[PDB]
Amino acid sequence: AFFQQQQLPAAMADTFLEHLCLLDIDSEPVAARSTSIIATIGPASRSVERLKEMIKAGMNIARLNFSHGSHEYHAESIANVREAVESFAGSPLSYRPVAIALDTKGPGSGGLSEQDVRDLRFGVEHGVDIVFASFVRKASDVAAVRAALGPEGHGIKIISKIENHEGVKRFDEILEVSDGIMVARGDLGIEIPAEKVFLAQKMMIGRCNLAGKPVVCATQMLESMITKPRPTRAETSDVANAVLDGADCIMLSGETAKGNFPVEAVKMQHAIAREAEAAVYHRQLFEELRRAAPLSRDPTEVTAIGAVEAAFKCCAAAIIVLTTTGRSAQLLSRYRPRAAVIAVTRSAQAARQVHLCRGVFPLLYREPPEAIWADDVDRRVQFGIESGKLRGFLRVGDLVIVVTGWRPGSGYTNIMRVLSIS
Amino acid sequence: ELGTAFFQQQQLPAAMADTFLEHLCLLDIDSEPVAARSTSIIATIGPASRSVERLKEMIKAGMNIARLNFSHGSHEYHAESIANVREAVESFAGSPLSYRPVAIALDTKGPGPGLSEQDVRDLRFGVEHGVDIVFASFVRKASDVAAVRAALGPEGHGIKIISKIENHEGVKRFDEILEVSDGIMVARGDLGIEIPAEKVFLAQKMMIGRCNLAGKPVVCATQMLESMITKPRPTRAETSDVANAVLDGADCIMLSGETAKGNFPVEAVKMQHAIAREAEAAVYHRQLFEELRRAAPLSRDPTEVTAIGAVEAAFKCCAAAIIVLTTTGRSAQLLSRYRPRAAVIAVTRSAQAARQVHLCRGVFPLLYREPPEAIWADDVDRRVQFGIESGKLRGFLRVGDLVIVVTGWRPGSGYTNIMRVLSIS
Amino acid sequence: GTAFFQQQQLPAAMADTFLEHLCLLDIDSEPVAARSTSIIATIGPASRSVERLKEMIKAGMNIARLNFSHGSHEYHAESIANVREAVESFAGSPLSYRPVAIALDTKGPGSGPGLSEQDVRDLRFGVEHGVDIVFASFVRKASDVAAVRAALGPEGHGIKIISKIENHEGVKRFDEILEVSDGIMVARGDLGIEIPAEKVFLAQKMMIGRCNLAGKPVVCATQMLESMITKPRPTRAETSDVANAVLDGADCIMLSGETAKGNFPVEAVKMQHAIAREAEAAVYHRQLFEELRRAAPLSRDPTEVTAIGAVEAAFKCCAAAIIVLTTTGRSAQLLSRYRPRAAVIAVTRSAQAARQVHLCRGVFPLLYREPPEAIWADDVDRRVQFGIESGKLRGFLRVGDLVIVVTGWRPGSGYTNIMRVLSIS
Amino acid sequence: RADVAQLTQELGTAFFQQQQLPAAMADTFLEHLCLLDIDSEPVAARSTSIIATIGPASRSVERLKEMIKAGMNIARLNFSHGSHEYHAESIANVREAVESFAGSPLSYRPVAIALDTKGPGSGPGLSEQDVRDLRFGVEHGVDIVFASFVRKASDVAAVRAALGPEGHGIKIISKIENHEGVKRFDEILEVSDGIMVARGDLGIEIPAEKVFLAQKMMIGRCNLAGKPVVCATQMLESMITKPRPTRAETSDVANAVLDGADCIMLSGETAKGNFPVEAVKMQHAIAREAEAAVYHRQLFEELRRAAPLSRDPTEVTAIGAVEAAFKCCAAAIIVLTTTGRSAQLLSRYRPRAAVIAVTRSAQAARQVHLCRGVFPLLYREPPEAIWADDVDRRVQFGIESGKLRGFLRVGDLVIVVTGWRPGSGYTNIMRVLSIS
Ligand SMILES: O=P(O)(O)OC[C@H]1O[C@](O)(COP(=O)(O)O)[C@@H](O)[C@@H]1O
Ligand SMILES: O=P(O)(O)OC[C@H]1O[C@](O)(COP(=O)(O)O)[C@@H](O)[C@@H]1O
Ligand SMILES: O=P(O)(O)OC[C@H]1O[C@](O)(COP(=O)(O)O)[C@@H](O)[C@@H]1O
Ligand SMILES: O=P(O)(O)OC[C@H]1O[C@](O)(COP(=O)(O)O)[C@@H](O)[C@@H]1O
Ligand SMILES: O=S(=O)(c1ccc(O)c(O)c1)c1ccc(O)c(O)c1
Ligand SMILES: O=S(=O)(c1ccc(O)c(O)c1)c1ccc(O)c(O)c1
Ligand SMILES: O=C([O-])C(=O)[O-]
Ligand SMILES: O=C([O-])C(=O)[O-]
Ligand SMILES: O=C([O-])C(=O)[O-]
Ligand SMILES: O=C([O-])C(=O)[O-]
Ligand SMILES: [K+]
Ligand SMILES: [K+]
Ligand SMILES: [K+]
Ligand SMILES: [K+]
Ligand SMILES: [Mg+2]
Ligand SMILES: [Mg+2]
Ligand SMILES: [Mg+2]
Ligand SMILES: [Mg+2]
């Protein structure tokens, strides 16, 4: 029964053609949904009660669109998101962190506009986790956003939105200085011929997967759900294909900001992403990612490849990793393991930000500290296992891969262990 | 010899990539498509696309197959639609550069446990009016296809039966249905109601893959550009859906309400044409050909053996086209199953085969009406030169180009066994 | 039949990985194909008798090597006369006649920087006596090949020059030497003294790989069955060395003392024949063909395009042979470079080309002696029928087999452009 | 180039020109052959073990010391010749020569002793002389038995029974010498510790032109099973009377290594020939060149794909460690092992990194020579009170010995493989350590 679920016959296929032939509508997804859902906050999704339903439906990142509304309006949205998120903190083994992303208005006819400088300062003051920088055309646009965030906003992730021909052409220099990319198909589809957007999307997703940096697919993914309870056949296909392309995140704009079915739009993206993740041809994907990732003398990078290889060998239910900044989890995620990457962290910001990386499930550690560092590490590992058991990721008898470091502090991951559950 | 500009167009850098990941990384929005659009467009005929003048614009925009939806309208209404399609098609018989055969497909109302009384009557109407294809609704098992085949009476055995897979049973019994059908339609509308909507993409990709493996045509249908029923431009999900259906391996893409009742029927056809052209150049032929080659069983059929040799030869020299002489369309279909980048120009004396080969990706039919030569080898040479001259006229070919020519050793269907490399003069 | 798929290591040939290919190799799977790697036998006191040469031709000797390091011009002229007498003793049966090439192996430069005066005289002797091939000793750079070509003069333009790589400089300047040579000999004797003995296998494997990539013949030479100079059976290392040279991709394997001075020249030829046959069936064609196709550059030459189409067609149908008409041997060489499992039966009127194509693996030359038919198409057909009848007599073909036939559109060399699938009747 | 650019800038272009690294990074096997370079020097320690047959030409203690220095890893006693008294003296001389280097534990090289049986002769199974010789082997503490003419699984069970309860730790390597052994190979391999391709008798029992097929098939199946395979007979035959081998002989040795053989053997070349030390030196030189010419890119991919999914933590850790070693061009993989099993599971994936196996078992240290690329280090120190400290001391012993023997330099990355509790069977940890 195990080998009939999660498209495992299609996953073992010798060719991509045979993989397609073996895809089965009766093969149920079992793994937790890996691709994060970004929901745009607006009148249809601003109330605390509505936000609680969206968190339960699968929203991982709340997007604030600074193209509309005042700073007072957005501060209220942030407070409501935090209130809804913290209403589940009473049960630490099931608490789900939710990131807050600020999407800038953009340069308009102008580099960095004066309104963007003020909005970015607002983001730092209100503790946003991510900035979706509009109309990034070159590396200096990213540097300007980074400078406007100042010394207090050093830890904020900058996701550059590629929205025009210049951004596509200067993609490599933009990705090099950004934390990730958003394929902003709305403006891109007006700036370049609409029939060419899929080429830009597939290229950018492929280059971000190669670089090991997050990539978001955005705009009109479930557009008809703004007024209708069910999406069109092209919309479900678009969501599934963005996941199959390799997108780390998928986004909802008007569907959640102003539509009549915000919760249903989140549920639909969750349902499709789960089905599409199981249909990924891991046999070829892992081989190509493994071959393309350069040789490295960084122990975190070396441990990450060893751990993902070990996870595939034993059909590991999860890879439990201890991380301070999220980096060790990101390096595991870049190899696209089928095993869930359970990231145990003390940082609340890193727990929110790792939603940008596909297949990373953040667990915010709030248990009493241990006096012995080795005992403290072992307790965080057992915490990952208990949360994993409660959430359905793990069962007794499963094998897990555990990734830790040799000393406290970020940058010292160098150990991989094979552990049998219970 | 060809120029550096030649190797920058039609995603040739992405086509030469060593891995699928590198192929994606090399896709370029500035790399323009050059080849003719190979995925056929099926447009549903209705009030918005029934007039002769509107049909002429749709033919110019790229419509290859006219679909008659027998779920609505009387036999009198459909006979008028057929006459208007034929009038619009024949209005271009004067210009070889603009003339294009257009197939007529009858889409049945559907079942009841099996073939309904109305379907028997509608299928008889199709035979009497000379339709080329039947899109059989709600096919669930092999016996449903046999019933449709039996209903195509004594005169309609040459009509192609494309089984529409619309429910869980059709998906589960797919292999037995494909074995007896000429092709398949992934009817996503009903399929998305019969099975969970989030599972339709799995059924679509599986069926397209199995049809590509079998070498049989597969159509992707329903809501591909739905928003264009009221809006002049489609959504980002809709263009993505069309491009991904072509990348999946679909031979045909379809328009329903977009062309039958919408406000922008011609623009919907133009949009599918534009997207299919871009998506066909983005196909990763290096891995696709290797896998089709490996999956296709060994064969002692000379048409099958010649077809793979010809497609291999076309890739080796970047041939502008493969010109094939075919009476039934079968030799062109066997070339099409290996997905060559070269256009397959099919020269036939059969007007029905010329219309039906639109079901096969990359087949460009040319109907030949010259009187037969007394010396058979001369008749063959005249048809090969007709394909070359039409190719030059239409932009497929130029003097100095290499073309692959596929012919047989004797007259009659079933004897294809020759592949030649010709330099265009 | 099921028995067909158990022979010639067909289970190992269909394997998905090289490891699984090795695991499926079967000592009970009998070779069926004709032996495709040519055997070069060096002539000497043990192999000069006309009666002894007839037995060596029957055992499988394809090329007779004259070592100009020993003997005078008078000695070599007698060797040539004896070889020709033994070869021509079988000309009374044209369907079974086996051409045998004559190769002149030069003494070398010695302490000199380039072409020695003795080599100039020996090369002129070769042209005057009609030798087919020159094995040029100690080639260190492209100008050494040009000097050999100049010494052959205008009358020796058709002689093939195979450069012997015997030292570090020849290995380092390999690419420039191969570019101007017709082929290469891995002369392991001197190479093993000039460079550390433990590194010779790396030079052998590299040169064979680069010659296979270039589509040019490569010979493996020296001490392959050394112990057979005095013993009736070779050592385990010797049979392994012959099998591995064939698996590496060598077009030819050579015997020196084993045939020139030993006590078992006929048995040494028979042993190389037996081993080469076993090793050719053990070649992993699935990966080899894929890599040769991918590495071979795109081409606009119709002979090159037809060759890859014909090899692909031959693999698709398990063709027993590819029958090719050739004037210079070039069309057969271009088929051979893709390493088909099907025998390449080359029909030619040129006695020299028939002898020289033994340099290319899997090419079986048939010398056609009949004067041309008045109708060129009938002369082409008669030559193809001669290939089929010789093939049937020699066991290459049976009724019911499929064969690929490679011809051109006009008389004269350079116009091959047609591939046809033919059933043997 | 993008996949190796940063590491090329860090380690230098000279590093990437050595040990056939350009040929190792090739995208196809054809390109791998085209990139093989006679100027690309081998750097890694020789990983294929050399088995030398002991006889009159290689019996003296002083001669044996030269053969150990030349590279002999396993001493073979051919029980087809000589009495029990003769073989006991050979064993004592081998042990005396081996122990003459024990004064320096950081450089001491263990040498295994293998007993090669006379065989069944005309009989259907285990002969009475073989039963007596096998009992002699157990009494004299031999490490390995090369069982002659194994034709079926019951032949190896008979050898195992003749070894008795005291010989349970002895490795049984079945010699495949006839058609029946080749045809029943899978059942023989399943119950054996490894295989020997005995080409001498095999070449008489089956047509000589078919021996290479049997050799390549058996080596491939042993590599797939992760069990040692020995290539034997006439590898450097001419060196019995001549100082240099023929071109076919060097080719045969190189091709046995490229085929995937864990061990290569010398028979008459060492036992009775005129150049025993030179024959060992020649096999050493060729094996080093051939190991660097192995196409690891395809080999690792195929071993990974063919090896079934596993829930055994030693197996899971082994593939993770070999993958990690390739990622960083690790100089070595240091593994703690009691029976040799954790080192054998690393060896089956054919890493380019040397597998330095630290063990307290003198027998396991000798027996791991059967596995390609395993360098045994015998740890003689008594256990620390705290088990975690005892583990760390053993790892440090491997690093210090690795530095001493030239395997490791400061700045190198090393992969360390250990377990969560004492005793055999609990390996489950992989660590990436930077050498300081
Ligand atoms: O992913 P990051 O940011 O490098 O953090 C990984 C770090 O986490 C640890 O596993 C635990 O460290 P702390 O005890 O400081 O939380 C370290 O050993 C390791 O260096
Ligand atoms: O594709 P089909 O229907 O098999 O037709 C292919 C046939 O066309 C030809 O090339 C030309 O035949 P006709 O002259 O009868 O049209 C035949 O030699 C070949 O058998
Ligand atoms: O292999 P080559 O030397 O190019 O010769 C091939 C030539 O042989 C032919 O098949 C037959 O030519 P001939 O009639 O002159 O022998 C030509 O059509 C073709 O050009
Ligand atoms: O390779 P083997 O025979 O399984 O031995 C590996 C064992 O060695 C160790 O690393 C150390 O164990 P010891 O302390 O008993 O020597 C164990 O943790 C592990 O189980
Ligand atoms: O799943 S894959 O192996 C694959 C292969 C061939 C195809 O045509 C295809 O659509 C998908 C894959 C996907 C994304 C990658 O970036 C990659 O490296 C591999
Ligand atoms: O037969 S092969 O596919 C092969 C693959 C892997 C091996 O390790 C091997 O020894 C042989 C091959 C491929 C290309 C060649 O140019 C060749 O000579 C052989
Ligand atoms: O701003 C965006 O997200 C867009 O334009 O697609
Ligand atoms: O009938 C159709 O086309 C459907 O259901 O999608
Ligand atoms: O000349 C030769 O043949 C050699 O050196 O091997
Ligand atoms: O017994 C042996 O070692 C042989 O036959 O090779
Ligand atoms: K915005
Ligand atoms: K209908
Ligand atoms: K010579
Ligand atoms: K013995
Ligand atoms: Mg925008
Ligand atoms: Mg329907
Ligand atoms: Mg020489
Ligand atoms: Mg024996």
DSSP letter string, B49-90: G-SHHHHHHHHHHTEEEEEEETTSS-HHHHHHHHHHHHHHHH
Ligand 3 binding pocket includes C412 (Cβ within 6 Å): yes
C–D: how many Cβ contacts below 8 A?
A: 199
Q: Which residue bears the tokens 């490569």? A: C218
Instruction: Give the closest-approach CA distance of B401 to chain A in angstroms.
Output: 29
| Token pair belonging to A84 | 């809804």
Task: Return the residue whose CA atom lies nearest to atom 8 of ligand 4.
Answer: D337
Q: Is D209 part of the contact surface with chain C (CB cutoff 8 Å)?
A: yes
Helix (H) or strand (E) holding B10: none
CB contact under 8 A, A305 and D319: no
List Cα–Cα distances, D120 to C42, D151, D184, D332, in angstroms: 44, 11, 17, 43
Q: Which of A7, A19, A20 to mutate to test the interface with B (most CBs of B within 10 A)?
A: A20
Alpha helical stretches, state H, D330-386: 341-347, 362-367
DSSP β-bridge partners for residue D194 = D173
> Which of B24, B237, B274 is nearest residue A202 as measured by Cβ atoms?
B24
Q: How far is the CA of C81 from the centre of ligand 9 (A)?
A: 24
Distance CA C147, CA C163 (A): 12
Q: Which residue bears the tokens 């493989």? A: D417
A406 is in an annotated binding site: no
Query: What are chain A's partners, defined as 3 or more CB pairs within 8 angstroms?
Result: B, D
**Reduced to 3 states, what is the DSSP secondary structure of residue D110?**
coil
Q: Is D412 part of the contact surface with chain A (CB cutoff 8 Å)?
A: no
Distance CA D363, CA D378 (A): 10
Maximum Cα–Cα distance across chain D: 65
CB contact under 8 A, D319 and A307: no
**Reduced to 3 states, what is the DSSP secondary structure of residue B219?**
strand
Pick the CATH number of B40-279 from 2.40.50.100, 3.40.250.10, 3.20.20.60, 3.20.20.120: 3.20.20.60
DSSP string of B242-304?
HHHHHHHT-SEEEESHHHHT-S-HHHHHHHHHHHHHHHHHTS-HHHHHHHHHHHSPP---HHH
Q: Which residue bears the tokens 């990974």? A: D304
List Cα–Cα distances, D154 to C113, D125, D191, in angstroms: 67, 9, 9
Question: In sequence order, which residues have a C-beta less than 8 Å from that of residue A108 and are 6 or more positions away?
Answer: none
| Token pair belonging to B338 | 């290996």
Instruction: Give the closest-approach CA distance of B368 to chain C in angstroms.
Output: 24
| Token pair belonging to A352 | 């929110």
| Token pair belonging to B55 | 């049909």
| Token pair belonging to B257 | 């309400």
Q: Which residue bears the tokens 């264009």? A: B228
Question: In sequence order, which residues have a C-beta less than 8 Å from that of residue D232 and are 6 or more positions away?
Answer: D51, D175, D196, D197, D198, D199, D200, D264, D265, D267
DSSP β-bridge partners for residue A101 = A63, A130
Question: In sequence order, which residues have a C-beta less than 8 Å from that of residue C421 and are 6 or more positions away?
Answer: B302, B305, B306, B417, B418, C313, C317, C402, C403, C404
CATH-assigned architecture of domain A33-276:
Alpha-Beta Barrel (3.20)
How is domain B285-423 classified at the CATH fold level?
Pyruvate Kinase; Chain: A, domain 1 (3.40.1380)
* A297 to chain D: closest CA residue: D328
| Token pair belonging to B256 | 């329903």
Do residues C34 and C340 lie in contact, with contact meaning Cβ atoms separated by under 8 Å? no
Helices B285-295 and B302-317, interaxial angle, to 10°?
A: 160
Ligand 1 binding pocket includes A392 (Cβ within 6 Å): no
Instruction: Give the closest-approach CA distance of A152 to chain D in angstroms.
Output: 32
Burial label, A37 (beta-carbon count in 10 A; 0-12, 13-18, 19+): buried
DSSP letter assigned to residue C375 = S
Class of domain C38-279: alpha beta
**Reduced to 3 states, what is the DSSP secondary structure of residue D241?**
coil
| Token pair belonging to D209 | 């032109």
Distance CA D286, CA A99 (A): 60
Do residues C5 and C11 lie in contact, with contact meaning Cβ atoms separated by under 8 Å? yes
> Which of D7, D319, D321 is nearest residue A297 as measured by Cβ atoms?
D7
CB contact under 8 A, D38 and C213: no
Q: Is C302 part of the contact surface with chain B (CB cutoff 8 Å)?
A: yes
> What CATH number belongs to D49-290?
3.20.20.60
Distance CA C112, CA C124 (A): 19
Q: Is D321 part of the contact surface with chain A (CB cutoff 8 Å)?
A: yes
Q: Which of C23, C287, C293 to mutate to test the pocket of ligand 6 (most atoms within 8 A of CB)?
A: C287
Ligand 8 binding pocket includes B139 (Cβ within 6 Å): no
Residue D108 CB: number of other CB atoms within 10 A?
Answer: 18
Ligand 2 binding pocket includes B81 (Cβ within 6 Å): no
List Cα–Cα distances, D354 to A155, C360, D338, in angstroms: 42, 42, 18
Distance CA D49, CA A178 (A): 52
Distance CA B224, CA A68 (A): 31
**Reduced to 3 states, what is the DSSP secondary structure of residue A31?**
coil
To 10 degrees, the CA torsion angle through C310, C312, C317, C321? 40
Do residues C308 and B312 lie in contact, with contact meaning Cβ atoms separated by under 8 Å? yes
Helices B302-317 and C302-317, interaxial angle, to 10°?
A: 140
Residue D291 CB: number of other CB atoms within 10 A?
Answer: 24
Instruction: Give the closest-approach CA distance of B58 to chain C in angstroms.
Output: 38
* B281 to chain A: closest CA residue: A199
Burial label, B167 (beta-carbon count in 10 A; 0-12, 13-18, 19+): middle
Q: Which atom of ligand 8 is the closest one to the Cα of B187?
A: 6
Distance CA D436, CA D431 (A): 15
| Token pair belonging to C128 | 């005057």
- The domain segmentation of chain D, as residue ranges, is 49-290, 296-434
List Cα–Cα distances, B3 to B8, B27, B313, in angstroms: 9, 20, 21
Residue C116 CB: number of other CB atoms within 10 A?
Answer: 19
Q: Which ligand is nearest to the CA of C287?
A: 6
Q: Which residue bears the tokens 């705290």? A: D386
Distance CA D359, CA D374 (A): 12
Class of domain D296-434: alpha beta
List Cα–Cα distances, B367 to B84, B100, B386, D138, in angstroms: 20, 9, 10, 88
Amino acid at B163: S
List Cα–Cα distances, A35 to A212, A225, A251, in angstroms: 15, 20, 10
Q: Reported resolution in A?
A: 2.0
Question: In sequence order, which residues have a C-beta less than 8 Å from that of residue D379 and are 6 or more positions away?
Answer: D358, D359, D360, D394, D397
Distance CA D71, CA D54 (A): 14
Distance CA C404, CA A415 (A): 60
Distance CA B152, CA B161 (A): 10
Distance CA A128, CA A168 (A): 27
CATH-assigned architecture of domain A282-420:
3-Layer(aba) Sandwich (3.40)
Q: Which of C23, C39, C286 to mutate to test the interface with D (most CBs of D within 10 A)?
A: C23
CB contact under 8 A, C282 and D216: yes
Q: How far is the CA of B104 from the centre of ligand 10 (A)?
A: 76
**Reduced to 3 states, what is the DSSP secondary structure of residue D389?**
helix
Do residues D6 and A296 lie in contact, with contact meaning Cβ atoms separated by under 8 Å? yes
Q: Which residue bears the tokens 């011929």? A: A193
Distance CA A226, CA A220 (A): 10
| Token pair belonging to D377 | 């280090």
